[PDB]
Paper text:
Like the scCST, the hCST (Ctc1, hStn1 and hTen1) complex is predicted to contain multiple OB-folds and it binds telomeric overhangs with high affinity and some specificity. Overall, hCST plays a role in telomere replication, and may also have a more general role under conditions of replicative stress. To further elucidate the role of hCST at the telomeres, we solved the structures of hTen1 in complex with the N-terminal domain of hStn1 (hStn1N), and the C-terminal domain of hStn1 (hStn1C) alone. These structures reveal that hStn1-Ten1 is a RPA-like complex and a structural homologue of Schizosaccharomyces pombe Stn1Ten1 (spStn1Ten1) and Candida tropicalis Stn1Ten1 (ctStn1Ten1).
Numbering used by the authors:
A (entry chain A): 24 to 92, 112 to 183
B (entry chain D): 2 to 119
The structure:
């Protein structure tokens, strides 16, 4: 029901449920929607979407981020050249998908994180072991 | 076509030659040298109770806008040289002044211990 905060390494290797495709299993926990944070290490642009290779220090995964659509004057030309690039930090909330034998995240939401003193990323690094200990590593229900 | 993940290593682990040739890594330190002509950066860190150097090659992160004297986190691949020091070939070089360094280091430790405890 939530966007599950997980290591990219677990996303990459959780077994898929045969009974309910698109649902993945971590210790008997049914995982679909995830929340990842990491460094952009690759950018590929297509007509309808961006592919952002995201590295969270445990693994690297492609996140497919669908393109959208004063407004063109104040914002758009500024949006134009603040685009996500290699080296940026991004947060991606979406679903785990398999496509052409590769695992991917299909984004429901994605944004560049301003993290100038590594505050958000340190907090994430510190929080994850706790969510695993309290929830994911505990018997499902 | 994705690279391997930038695994966290403490800089004195990189310094002491504990990261195998060709590994992909994140490390950190204070930027103490930038020479654009030779595309070289040196990151420095103190640890009980010596100074430790991490050699970085900046070719892929040029044009590099240096904050010499500031803390950085580098993401890249470690490469043996013939035969000076091992160098990190940066793919990302990020200024993080004033990150809470000891908190970073604790987060790295907790992450490793969790992985080990699993």
């Amino acid at each position: 029901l939530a966007f599950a905060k997980l290591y990219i390494r677990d996303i990459l290797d959780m077994k898929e449920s045969r009974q309910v495709p698109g649902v993945f299993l971590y210790n008997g926990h049914p995982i679909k929607q995830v929340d990842v944070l990491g460094t952009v290490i690759g950018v590929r642009e297509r007509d309808a979407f961006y592919s952002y290779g995201v590295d969270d220090s445990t693994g690297v995964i492609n996140c497919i981020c669908w393109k959208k659509l004063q407004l063109k004057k104040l914002q758009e030309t500024i949006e134009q050249k603040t685009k996500i690039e290699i080296g940026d930090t991004i947060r991606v909330r979406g679903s785990i998908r398999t496509y052409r034998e590769e695992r991917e995240i299909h984004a429901t939401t994605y944004y560049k994180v301003d993290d100038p003193v590594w505050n958000i990323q340190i907090a994430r690094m510190l929080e994850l072991p706790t969510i695993y200990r309290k929830v994911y590593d505990q018997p499902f229900h | 076509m994705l690279p391997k993940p930038g695994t966290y290593y403490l800089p004195w682990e990189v310094s002491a030659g504990q990261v195998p040739d060709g590994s992909t890594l994140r490390t950190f330190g204070r930027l103490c040298l930038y020479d654009m002509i030779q595309s070289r950066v040196t990151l420095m860190a103190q640890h009980g109770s010596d100074q430790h150097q991490v050699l970085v090659c900046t070719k892929l992160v040029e044009p590099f806008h240096a904050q010499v004297g500031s803390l950085y986190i580098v993401l890249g691949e470690l490469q043996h040289q013939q035969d000076r020091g091992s160098v990190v070939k940066a793919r990302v070089l990020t200024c993080v002044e004033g990150m809470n360094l000891p908190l970073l280091e604790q987060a790295i430790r907790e992450q490793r211990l969790y992985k080990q405890e699993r």
